[PDB]
Amino acid sequence: APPAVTISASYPGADAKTVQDTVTQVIEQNMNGIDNLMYMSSNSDSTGTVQITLTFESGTDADIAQVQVQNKLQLAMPLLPQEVQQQGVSVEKSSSSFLMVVGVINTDGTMTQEDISDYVAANMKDAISRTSGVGDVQLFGSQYAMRIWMNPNELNKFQLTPVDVITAIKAQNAQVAAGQLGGTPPVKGQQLNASIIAQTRLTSTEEFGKILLKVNQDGSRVLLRDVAKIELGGENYDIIAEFNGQPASGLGIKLATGANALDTAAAIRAELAKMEPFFPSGLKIVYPYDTQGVFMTMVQLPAGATQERTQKVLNEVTHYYLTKEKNNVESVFAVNGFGFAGRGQNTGIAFVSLKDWADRPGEENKVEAITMRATRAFSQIKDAMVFAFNLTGFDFELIDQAGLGHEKLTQARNQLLAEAAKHPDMLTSVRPNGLEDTPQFKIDIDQEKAQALGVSINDINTTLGAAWGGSYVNDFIDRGRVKKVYVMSEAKYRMLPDDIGDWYVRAADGQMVPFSAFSSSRWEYGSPRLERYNGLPSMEILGQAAPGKSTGEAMELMEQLASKLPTGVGYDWTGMSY
């Protein structure tokens, strides 16, 4: 198969367009001078995430492709936002599918899903990641960060802002290089040499809680716990897993292009065996997907669907396997927020493991018949593509060739789909592979009013972003491991449009100014996922030949339909169709 190298980066709190236009385009523009590149594709998401896939000619040395990519990326790194560089960009040379899933549960319910995910991130993931043959490790959960959950009524009460919180955290959770006593070059007759130790990183919520934000006129003390709740919690909250309905975390492991599957899997088990003896009580490893005896189930809801609606669908899927398929199915490991296609609130995946082959006698209890019955049983779930598959048609990109923009490319897409519908004799299931635009909240900062009041735009924007999107401030040490600190609004002050008006920003003259005084807002539509293909805006269309027709005939018709689209809209074939 043609080797693929993948770049991943992230920008916490950024929308798809922001990601695209400060990250994705910049990287793409700088992917020159790389040998044997067939094509390039990318997603920029409203999760703050970009994924760029570079697919090389068959035969290419995947080590060389990776290195040449990494090198070009390194030279583009200074062009990306500070916020993105500091998340750490990854470059990977792996299969798009999983080799195995390591599951982790706590049989004594002493640990929640969130504790288990941190345990895994903090104690297991790195050693698994440095095992040879391990191309990509996905945590089904998040590592803990120190979370500072800000309250805007309390901040306004003491005339503070997220800017003051952030500043104070950098100043008081600091690791200072302070030299030595009797350091070199020394005076003659010096008897004492000793390191000077000054501030050191904080290690606990108690410590963060006593960060001193300010001393008032009466000499009383405003501490950080006076304006914030302080707790360990995930760096993000997007991915939640379950194993047979019980709280779980895990690692989804993908094989490095060209490594050996069997040997890689053995070396993974050897490393886990080194870890088990030091597990806290209750923690246990389960093995829910080893690459037949296994299959997956994909859950894809339309964009706009929350975690709660995706969970409802996963539960129906899990319930079906744990009741209607009891006799064939040993386990289900279900992940809400990660899907076959990557990552979102509207997607999920279920890894299913079967009982021993010998105890599923009969044609009708083998993988093929099971996956078929399940797809059948899930085919009538509402507003959800749900299907079961082990691990055919055509793959078309519609392309913006003349700076037309997202909205126009959408109309041109729809015009092609509407014509493809009128040839059901030749084409079936012609459909976008991506996502539909959804409601978004457009807020316009009034530059004139901000200037008249003496409110700085950087304070406005840091206030908005930090509170509603979260900000990575700096690092701390949690049980001797380096981890992140995040400031963000407590949930309840960032839920509804009217909450915007409870956030205050301090003006140059000391007055507190509500966000309502210098902003205005409306609802509009935009994209939760912007797609690009060889550096240009694009929209991926899937489809197949109708029954009794050749892929080639179908493709021929798609090319004809495509020649009738508005000026500036081209296309190409990719993937299976190249």
Next chain:
Amino acid sequence: APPAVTISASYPGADAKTVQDTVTQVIEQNMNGIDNLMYMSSNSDSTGTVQITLTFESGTDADIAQVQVQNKLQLAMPLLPQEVQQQGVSVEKSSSSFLMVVGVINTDGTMTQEDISDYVAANMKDAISRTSGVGDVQLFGSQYAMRIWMNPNELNKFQLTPVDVITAIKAQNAQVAAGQLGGTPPVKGQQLNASIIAQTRLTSTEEFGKILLKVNQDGSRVLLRDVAKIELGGENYDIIAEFNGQPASGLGIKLATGANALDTAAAIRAELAKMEPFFPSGLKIVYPYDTQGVFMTMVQLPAGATQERTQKVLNEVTHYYLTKEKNNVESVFAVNGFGFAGRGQNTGIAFVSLKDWADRPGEENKVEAITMRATRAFSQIKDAMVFAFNLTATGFDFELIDQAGLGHEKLTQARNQLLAEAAKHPDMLTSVRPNGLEDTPQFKIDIDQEKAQALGVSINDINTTLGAAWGGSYVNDFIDRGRVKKVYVMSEAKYRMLPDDIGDWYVRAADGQMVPFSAFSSSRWEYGSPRLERYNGLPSMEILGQAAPGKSTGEAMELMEQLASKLPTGVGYDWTGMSY
């Protein structure tokens, strides 16, 4: 073909010594412990550009040489000025010469040279640059940037400066990450989830025009369009091309070290075929140099010669091929501001393409005879090396090296001493000449620290105001027709042309007073270099020449060594290129 890896960096507005001492030396000091390295050279130019060439043993795996060069370059990257990093340092592994030129014109005259170059940079370059086998791609022109052309009279009228303009553009041409309503972790039961969209990058001159610089005490508004002109324009204005005298742009394509010429050319053509159907009306590709059938004409004036003077020499060249060689020549693609040497205002190149082999019967109508006549005709042009050649065995390549911190001026003195001795030996040595450029007048300005401190004017404010105005500053990115591009502030032309204009620029002190530049500076003319060369990490001057009629290069090299042994203390030499 010894394989060569090239590092390239750009520092807008920098003089040759600033480039050498803030960029080139820092890189060079880390280039050691690289396998199979024969030598290393560099030029640091007053165009703000550095090019370091690293030449490897024959047979070296180019992939590995690039990887190793780049890994040493990373040691230097955080020590480089931010203005360099942001332009994008590049590391390439290519042949030094062109495989082909892709020319672009507009047969309806609805697009200027500037529009054609932008269309090429924005819709065509990147895909060619990514094509397998393409080692280096040179744009004959510049991508559009959003240009803010400041007026210092209008800036001083409102107590503003380029620092205020830069600051307002960063604040109001912003792409803000603003989070979500109802995002995770939510209050349980939350139904509404929506991205929050706040400021987004500007996309048009109109939007840049209404950037709000200030509100006065009286309530009225100062907008950016009240202190500047606002238009799309090149990131730079140095490179200008023509095809048979008509406005044009194009791509010079060099081949990646060891890649197949036919296959790489074919893939380039296949890639252009995807672009053609989406051109605006009138735009067309032409093919002025495929690699006999073709040749080039180097134009090289002395340093200090402007675009205008280079143009006239180029016109005389183009004119010659279109009048006297019109039965032979199909096309001339002439580029002003780029040539064999790399890049500068005193350089140009013409790529010439001849009619079909069989439409040119006779030996006087073959490439060899045509180039000889062309070179003969151009020999008479004054203050210009012009010659034509169809792309070494009698020639030599000498490096004079400063080995004792003597500095550039002493190295010139020593160079001149070698050249005048070489001149007194016509029997052994013909046409011994520097490969580089002569010093030229430069404007030395001294900031008086004490006066600045006394008036309460910051040095960063002074320096940004000088630099941004007379040199241009890359502020941030914007989005032009869906594509990321740069934003530049610079003085409108008329306010940065004469020495007296220095005094029209004001900086604002801490106490709010506008202070003219003349209050804290003094200036004088001096000489300095527009191209500082280095060889193996040391200051150098390359000297070219050839063995006199009949005598071998070994004999001629032996003489240069004898001459060089008599040069002052600390001046040494080495042999490079042919002579290695």
Next chain:
Amino acid sequence: HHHHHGSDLGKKLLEAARAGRDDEVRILMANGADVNAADVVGWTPLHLAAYWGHLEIVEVLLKNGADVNAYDTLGSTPLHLAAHFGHLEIVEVLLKNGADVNAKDDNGITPLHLAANRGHLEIVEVLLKYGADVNAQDKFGKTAFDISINNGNEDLAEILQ
């Protein structure tokens, strides 16, 4: 004028109004679908049809009794959306069916401010024609004239006069 959540047929209608499926809107209407079904941001099928420029659906929803002056959760009406996005025929249709030409959103923004801001000149004329207060002022104290000055759109300034 702020309408609440429907279900199943309301959801189908909202989605069909949004995608321009003229036939499907007519079927759902004949089968009793709530003509003022609102989504989570307060958008009725008329908001959707107006935003995405589907004229026939706009006419059909109005024939079947759609609230011409529906408010989304930020006080914005279908006429706002139509004026903002340059949908001339839809603007005309809405105003002919009782659209409030001077409806202000939560921010004091009227359809004329929006049409003005995006330079949609034929729409500005129709709005004035139908009684638009040319001196209406948003929360920041701006009129459509101030907008024309800030944008540097001389054509618009002369229309407002």
